[PDB]
């Protein structure tokens, strides 16, 4: 016996059919639209939405005045409004099933650097975040797979230790100045 915790999920599910052009083409468009690394990063969001929809399936089977549906459903409807997926006018549990994969990947940090005009490419943004140039209010975030909350969006900036924000230059601009 030790003092360790052995719990861990798996965060993706490999699909049933390995090779079909309708699926390989439809995953690879989303990789190219959103700068993802491999197919696992598509198979991850698709797996989290496979759980959000499956939990909302069993709530729709219950009685409409069942208190378990009223409490647990109003939490799930709350947790999607805060990450900017559903909306205030559409906060009913029927609409959770009307969600798509790229509804979620609009809220990855890799895409929200690009949509805000900080990066000049969707690929240039995955650079910057891993290059530690991006901060969320005070915190250098080093992961593109970072679901920006709806209040956590309107201030995302250039990480004051960076050459872009606070302006101490890196290795390259120092060595070029060591010649002239």
């Amino acid at each position: 016996p030790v003092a360790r915790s052995w719990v861990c999920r798996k965060t993706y599910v490999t699909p049933r059919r390995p090779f079909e052009k309708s699926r390989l083409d439809q995953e690879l468009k989303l990789i190219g639209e959103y700068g993802l690394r491999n197919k696992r990063e598509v198979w991850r969001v698709k797996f989290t939405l496979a759980k959000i929809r499956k939990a909302a399936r069993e709530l729709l089977t219950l009685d409409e005045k069942d208190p378990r549906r009223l409490f647990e459903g109003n939490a799930l409807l709350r947790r999607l409004v805060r990450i900017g997926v559903l909306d205030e006018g559409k906060m009913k549990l029927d609409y959770i099933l009307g969600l798509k994969i790229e509804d979620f990947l609009e809220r990855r940090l890799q895409t929200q650097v690009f949509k805000l005009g900080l990066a000049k490419s969707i690929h240039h943004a995955r650079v910057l975040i891993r290059q530690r140039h991006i901060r969320v209010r005070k915190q250098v975030v080093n992961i593109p797979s970072f679901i920006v909350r709806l209040d956590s969006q309107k201030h995302i900036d250039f990480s004051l230790r960076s050459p872009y924000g606070g302006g101490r230059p890196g290795r390259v601009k120092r060595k070029n100045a060591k010649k002239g």
Partner: peptide
Amino acid sequence: TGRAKRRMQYNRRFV
């Protein structure tokens, strides 16, 4: 390798 290999294929097939 990495996503730049996947960057190439998206441009190659779908752009």
